[PDB]
Write a protein that binds this ligand. Structure first.
Ligand code: NA
Ligand code: NA
Ligand code: NA
Lengths: 597, 597, 597
């Protein structure tokens, strides 16, 4: 009677309890207290209610779904996935997540505390999957929201090492969906060939979604995998902090990016990356602009550590038939980034910043401006010819560089022939320090290679900190690049032996609102006159020069050339020196040529 | 007999347990294991011990207080506020928190894990309240400390949307009191009209208090609300990290600040703000200097993202009859900040840094120095006339600006008439990049408007990066501003067409220890002499000029003006050019005027 | 019968339970649910299974070890150390941790949630100890790994205040061993005289180990203690974030460092330090290079707040018979650091950066390069003569300084006599702001004191922001320092009254590839000639000068000196001025001397 009730499932509901024997505390039953927590064990049972042990040959999916569905029905809670066990998933979910190749459906206010391990069984080999899906509809546009869903703990999600079956397939760990106040904290995602580990939001719908203190380990493994971004941030007021990302496959060096920031007010901070092609995309895709507008603004990449093989930050924006995307108000700061040991040209072109074309290769759709790149370090090994502070491959409406340290082959680069970007407001402050690792490697190359259609309202203040006499020039403009309302200077330090410092193939430095200064060697010849006497340049290509001054000592006693020069209508320089004794003088002098500065 | 004991409240204390059947484990009873945790359910009961369900019509306050008081009596623990329920509070607390309009009294070592929702009932409508109070006395000065108290979880505190009843009232979420090692992590505070969500410390008493990963949503809603700072940090070695703050009301744009840092060794990092008037106050109030001294030092605002309507960082210090407050050793870095879309003058004057007067409007009490503002971005839309890198409205003893990007109407500003601050050690390094969003908007305005009583030991190195010919001047000193032992330079780039570059209305640039350089147009006339021949300025206002040099080309063949000039006692410039053929020459030239540089 | 089973230890395993009466949930027993968690109470029992109360006279060690060992046997879990109790440890462990003076042995996948207090009993007074040890062997080289071990909670580890018995002894809180994915979060370590609180890794073996939100309070207390680094990071992909470190003893000001970063891809962020000698070591020790290679790279110290008495960041690398250590790719950024109030020379020499000799004092073994120091603030009080931006005491292969604010006695320093470092690639950008706290204190001192064997490929761009006429020179090279392929400039602002600006005791500024500019006063005398007329310097020590220009006004009406000068073979300067009326002129002028700039 009483014995029977006690051994029944209702037994615990008949045993009284009062907290610490406190007479002022609730008189409850044991079952009530045990009902304050919930684990997968409370649903991991056969139809008669007997517990099932997890393992390689047990598909845990329906049991976890039942737990989620039930806790959802009570307004939420946290389900623990117990430590000490590996819980295998072995079949697809059903309903609104089947269109997403979903395994488990997440539900609002239902948190998962993953302390044990979740493993994918070989049912998923060569197939698509998205392990945790927060959509409730096959069509994301008719999906409801996922709110207040947190996954956390010390546990693991293991994708079982299976390769993709076909490049067209997609694979994900956590697809939060149209997600609001959702997060992943503490979890290790490992051992896969996937497209993403976590995606946050859906085409701008969502808010307040975060990935923190997670580890992502070896999540690309095959030539079949088309592309990878480990965390894809597709809702605003969201981001990634204090994570670790590591890949070891060769394929990852060519296709994988750690983070993609695709909506406004998003961030990527304090994370360490190794073995990836790319650091972060920061891109406003017009096809993803439904939920939070057409502008990506307030984008922050800060205080990360990366060894990569391709590009650290990739900026973009694009358009559709009905929507134009814009990118502005970005800060990239405090990051320390290297291109890993590799042969030149063996992975995508190495870059700290890349201004990339759209997915169809168009370089004339972008609207990127008000970007600040400051207080970062970049290094590439001396053999990596394809390394640049910025590869400027598409139209740019502004990017400002202050107080960085760049130590790679090029400072500014774009390939000739290719795209001919239209450039406005590119600012390279004199406080950017140009390293010398690539000294002596730059035969035939221009340090700032300005292979653009045009440059306007831009500043390039070149300052070397060691010699590199192998380079063709410090900065070169082809004749095809228009240049106006710009300031281009080359500091003389470490330049005395350079044949070419600044080169303007179309004589663009003569423009009315071009402000330039650079060293040049000039031959001069004086009149015979004893006393104050003019010296004039033998060459006539200085009609643009507003002043020039001596960078050379005067080895002579009997005369001195002018310290300073102006020009004449015929393009000669002229200055007044001094003949202590008369005679025609002929000298070769290093001058700082200046125009309007 | 046995049946009776088992169904009694002591029943669980009669059922044996040994962990996982391990014979080396303690032989315990069920009640002992259940006593390892505690929830509000263990106290949320009527006088007969029957559990009460929470809800809109149940006042949960006495039950939560009883739980806190009891756990306190045992040396501490963590009380869980269960998920899946909304727990309403409906009356004020009693005792030492009644003077603070307290609801719940916090106690040392007693943590709250808020997984469910705490809601305020309409009893609090139009009234003051402070939901959680750590003071044990009505008079904070005779209060004991609160130590080792942490509030955390995925839950919510909802202030029920009630407006303030009167501007004089105060409202708070968590008043920690004289708090040591206390924190709030993970909680969402929403739906209110309050003064603060969380306050840390009391007039410098406290230490090691933090707010992390909390969200603060819509916490100002009425014209009645006098003021708001979401987190007020009033103890040292304390701060705010990785939080989200969002307001939507119009009133918030005029009164709300996200954080106030009021004691030394405090920080505000990695947080995102939207819809606020202000970012952070960083202020040493002499009236709050009892617990940690008279100095606010080691103040850090870093790596935040903000869209605001007024000022990002507001610096101050003030005095009382017996105490003077000082502010020094501050760093503001890596932040990306915008003034939101708004009409000019429709909210408090937009600023990245504001040096504010005291609460009584006094601008002659402040002692603010050794501030570093570096590697930040600031943007204001082109129509916002009231936008400045710094509004310098009170005495300043030092502020240093390096490697920022400011894109707004003014760089340095203070309104004329108003306060006449005394300025020392203002440093504006050439590495600050001046954006061009406000180009063409600056009719009648000075980019650096130096409306001060005096400027000493200061550096302004102005560098433009595009043209703006609408501005009256790059920098202007009224005749009322003394200027000494200072360096003021205007780079020539994008200045060739400017009528005025630097303006010194009192001819202050002639001071003995003033070091200045800027472009000017000058008319000159030569002697008739063939050969080396002097040119002299027609105007006599260059007695302060130590050298000048040509910024113009020479369109002539038969002569050249001097490349470089010095002056004469009468205030003319003079240099030696060259007449190939003789004749009096008359030319108009753009020169860089220099004094002691 | 049934009564007997129920009161036995197996009783709970006979009482049925089904979660919330849900008929689809597992039919379990109470014991199963209680077995989901585990605490120290489940092992803190006598041999008959009766629970023992912890306290001062109970040694809790064997019971905690038994708990750890058992949970380990089940594949892991989290053991809670209950709140409300102090758990004393009173004897050493046995087995593989005895060689490490271990107390408790940590085991893989076994987490400790420390909510209560762990205290050391006086058995440990005057003895060595390491409280938690992750090694399983006395010899670390034959030790197995510790993986997936996390210690966290709101609890405390108290070292009981005992002094060290002898300087040779070692003491530690948590020695993780060869540790992979291990962490400490939330814990307060206090009240000791120890060598370290936490060590991560062993001679480069380990990965993904972190210390977050921990507090470290008063952990050095005696003159006996040889040395202290609070967190020692000796494995890669590891670091310290958001911690608090505080010492109050005088001894700590001379021996204690907060963090030591000893392997690649390690970081120290967002932490606050007070009362320590040092901030962080960043050092590649060749004796510790077994597990992760010979290079420390990707080292990050960012956004910390410190008041220290010695040096903030200390860089090093050294060698053994068979291994050479290298240090490169380091970033030190956003930190705000002060030397605390102290007498000059009363603690180790104050420095923001120190390039230190090896432990045997050798300054010729180091290979340190590609370091970026940017956007930091440093302050030392005016009386602290021993304060420097960088003490450069050992060979340096590169360090770059951009956009810092340094306000201390020296900018660059090394003591004369002592080491004679070989310096390459030291870069001091003009954007570093030199504060004026030490103005008037620098009698007999050189601001940049270049006491080196040699300097190559280096840049020193000195910019003052106030006067300090007490200093002997802005920069001085002794004749013993070679200088080549370098750029050394002194901006003229605030220098007009300085006798010496740049000093080159060996006339090193004449070198072929030395690029220098600085102010000097020069006496000149003209010829008699009316009209354009040469002026020449009376002194002949300007054979290295390529140009010079006037920094002085001309008080004369009847003549003007040249605005600009070049030199002559005999070392005189010469320029062409203008005599309106003839006569020999004699003037004393302030010039900017330039060489190849
Ligand atoms: Na073109
Ligand atoms: Na005045
Ligand atoms: Na030497």
């Amino acid at each position: 009677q009483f014995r029977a009730i006690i051994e029944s499932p209702e037994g615990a509901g008949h045993v009284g309890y009062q907290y610490r024997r406190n007479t002022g505390s609730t008189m409850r039953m044991v079952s009530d207290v045990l009902d304050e927590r919930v684990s997968l064990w409370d649903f991991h049972c056969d139809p008669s209610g007997n517990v099932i042990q997890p393992g390689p040959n047990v598909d845990s999916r329906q049991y976890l779904q039942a737990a989620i569905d039930y806790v959802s029905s009570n307004g939420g809670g946290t389900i623990t996935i117990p430590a000490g066990y590996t819980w295998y998933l072995g079949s697809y979910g059903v309903g609104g997540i089947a269109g997403h190749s979903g395994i488990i459906q997440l539900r609002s206010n239902v948190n998962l505390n993953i302390e044990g391990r979740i493993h994918l069984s070989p049912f998923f080999d060569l197939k698509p999957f998205q392990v945790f899906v927060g959509f409730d509809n096959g069509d994301p546009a008719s999906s409801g929201n996922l709110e207040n869903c947190h996954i956390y703990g010390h546990g693991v999600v293991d994708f079982g090492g299976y390769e993709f079956g076909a490049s067209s397939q997609l694979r994900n760990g956590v697809a939060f969906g149209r997600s609001y106040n959702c997060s992943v904290t503490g979890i290790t995602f490992q051992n896969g060939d996937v497209t993403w580990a976590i995606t946050l939001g859906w085409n701008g719908y969502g808010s307040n979604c975060y990935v923190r203190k997670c580890r992502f380990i070896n999540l690309v493994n095959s030539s079949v995998n088309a592309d990878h971004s480990t965390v894809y941030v597709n809702c605003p007021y969201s981001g990634v902090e204090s994570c670790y990302f590591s890949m070891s496959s060769s394929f990852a060096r060519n296709i994988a990016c750690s983070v993609a920031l695709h909506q406004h007010d998003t961030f990527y901070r304090g994370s360490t990356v190794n073995g990836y092609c790319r650091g972060a995309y920061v891109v406003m895709h017009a096809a993803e602009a439904a939920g939070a507008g057409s502008y990506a603004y307030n984008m922050q990449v800060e205080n990360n550590i990366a060894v990569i093989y391709g590009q650290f930050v990739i900026l973009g924006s694009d358009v559709t038939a009905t929507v134009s995307g814009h990118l502005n108000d970005v800060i990239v700061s405090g990051n320390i980034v290297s291109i890993g040991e590799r042969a030149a040209f063996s992975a995508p072109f190495g870059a700290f910043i890349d201004i990339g074309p759209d997915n169809s290769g168009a370089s004339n759709v972008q609207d990127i401006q008000r970007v600040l790149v400051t207080g970062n370090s970049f290094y590439a090994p001396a053999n990596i010819t394809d390394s640049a502070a910025i590869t400027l491959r598409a139209n740019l409406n502004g990017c400002t560089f202050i107080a960085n340290n760049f130590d790679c082959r090029y400072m500014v680069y774009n390939a000739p022939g290719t795209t001919s970007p239209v450039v406005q407001n590119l600012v390279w402050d004199k406080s950017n320090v140009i390293g010398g690792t690539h000294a002596n490697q730059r035969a035939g190359q221009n340090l700032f290679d300005m292979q653009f259609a045009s440059v306007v309202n831009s500043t390039i203040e070149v300052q070397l900190s060691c010699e590199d006499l192998s380079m063709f020039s410090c900065i070169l403009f082809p004749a095809s690049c228009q240049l106006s309302y710009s300031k281009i200077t080359v500091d003389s330090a470490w330049t005395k032996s350079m044949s070419n410092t600044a080169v303007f193939e179309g004589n663009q430095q003569a423009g009315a609102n071009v402000y330039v200064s650079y060293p040049a060697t000039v031959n001069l010849t004086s009149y015979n006159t004893q006393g104050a006497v003019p010296f004039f340049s033998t060459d006539t290509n200085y009609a643009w020069v507003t002043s020039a001054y001596s960078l050379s000592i005067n080895e002579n006693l009997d005369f001195s050339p002018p310290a300073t020069y102006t020009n004449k209508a015929n393009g000669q320089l002229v200055g007044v020196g001094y003949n202590e004794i008369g005679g025609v003088r002929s000298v070769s002098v290093r001058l700082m040529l200046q125009r309007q500065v």
